[PDB]
Amino acid sequence: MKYIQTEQQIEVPEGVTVSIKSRIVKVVGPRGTLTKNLKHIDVTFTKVNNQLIKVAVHNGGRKHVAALRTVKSLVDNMITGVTKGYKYKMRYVYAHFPINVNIVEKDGAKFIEVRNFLGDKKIRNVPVRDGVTIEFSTNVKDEIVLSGNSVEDVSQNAADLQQICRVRNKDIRKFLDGIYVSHKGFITEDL
RNA sequence: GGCAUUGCCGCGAAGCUACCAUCCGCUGGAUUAUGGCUGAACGCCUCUAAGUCAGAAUCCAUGCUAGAACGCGGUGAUUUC
Numbered sequence: 001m002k003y004i005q006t007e008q009q010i011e012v013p014e015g016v017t018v019s020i021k022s023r024i025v026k027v028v029g030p031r032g033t034l035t036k037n038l039k040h041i042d043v044t045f046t047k048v049n050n051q052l053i054k055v056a057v058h059n060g061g062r063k064h065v066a067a068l069r070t071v072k073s074l075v076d077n078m079i080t081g082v083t084k085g086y087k088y089k090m091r092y093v094y095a096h097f098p099i100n101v102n103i104v105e106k107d108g109a110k111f112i113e114v115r116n117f118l119g120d121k122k123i124r125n126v127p128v129r130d131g132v133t134i135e136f137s138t139n140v141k142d143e144i145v146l147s148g149n150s151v152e153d154v155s156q157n158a159a160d161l162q163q164i165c166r167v168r169n170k171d172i173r174k175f176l177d178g179i180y181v182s183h184k185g186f187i188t189e190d191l
Numbered sequence: 192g193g194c195a196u197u198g199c200c201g202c203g204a205a206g207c208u209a210c211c212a213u214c215c216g217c218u219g220g221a222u223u224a225u226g227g228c229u230g231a232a233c234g235c236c237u238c239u240a241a242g243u244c245a246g247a248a249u250c251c252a253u254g255c256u257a258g259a260a261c262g263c264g265g266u267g268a269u270u271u272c
């Protein structure tokens with residue numbers, strides 16, 4: 001159809017400043033600064049009233065206007081990550097063998113060490129992405145929490161931890177052992 | 192000592208040689224399938240569309256062989272008569 005114009009809104013809260021050069025977005029908030037390169041999408045940003053950014057596609061097809069809403073969501077996620085932050089809670093699940101998850105250093109790189117997964121003798125090392133903070137939650141049994149400004153990095157670190165613990169050569173409907181994302185929310189409560 | 196078309200027999204150094212002997216046979220990236228992240232399309236959902244992660248005896252490199260006899264570089268000496 002090639003819709004003449006399609007646009008989405010990006011509400012900017014008070015403590016957030018959004019600097020958008022050609023398609024390099026820099027969002028700054030209480031928690032830090034996030035940056036994204038969107039030169040692959042061909043959209044047009046415009047600041048309306050310092051609390052609203054409009055992102056528009058002109059003469060755009062179906063896929064183009066779908067990716068317009070994707071761009072809106074990505075900038076929203078940046079703003080949410082610099083205001084509220086992101087936290088993914090993972091639970092260790094095991095029937096017999098206790099999964100031993102720890103934080104270790106190797107050349108100063110902050111790996112998450114997983115030992116004894118399904119009785120294995122192999123040690124699974126998952127690097128911690130920069131900006132992602134790993135805390136083990138006392139008052140909840142076998143809970144690891146990954147927090148950070150960028151949902152991309154926190155969710156990908158959680159997914160890496162989940163995929164390092166995939167069961168091979170077994171019926172995974174029975175052998176349910178693993179480290180699974182149980183909660184995905186924000187750092188600041190009730191925001 | 193000769194000859195017996197190496198006369199025959201035992202041992203036999205060297206050389207050649209045998210999974211019949213011994214030694215040696217490298218580690219990075221990108222990927223496929225697949226499993227994922229974020230995420231619209233389609234207020235939800237979604238590994239997919241934009242973007243993105245891991246990943247095969249695969250691929251391309253590292254490494255190994257040849258060195259273009261019309262590919263190239265550095266360097267030495269260049270004829271007293």
Ligand SMILES: [Mg+2]
Pocket residue numbers: 169170
């Ligand atoms: Mg079986």
Ligand SMILES: [Mg+2]
Pocket residue numbers: 194
């Ligand atoms: Mg005679």
Ligand SMILES: [Mg+2]
Pocket residue numbers: none
């Ligand atoms: Mg004789």
Ligand SMILES: [Mg+2]
Pocket residue numbers: none
């Ligand atoms: Mg998801």
Ligand SMILES: [Mg+2]
Pocket residue numbers: 239
């Ligand atoms: Mg794609």
Ligand SMILES: [Mg+2]
Pocket residue numbers: none
């Ligand atoms: Mg030659």
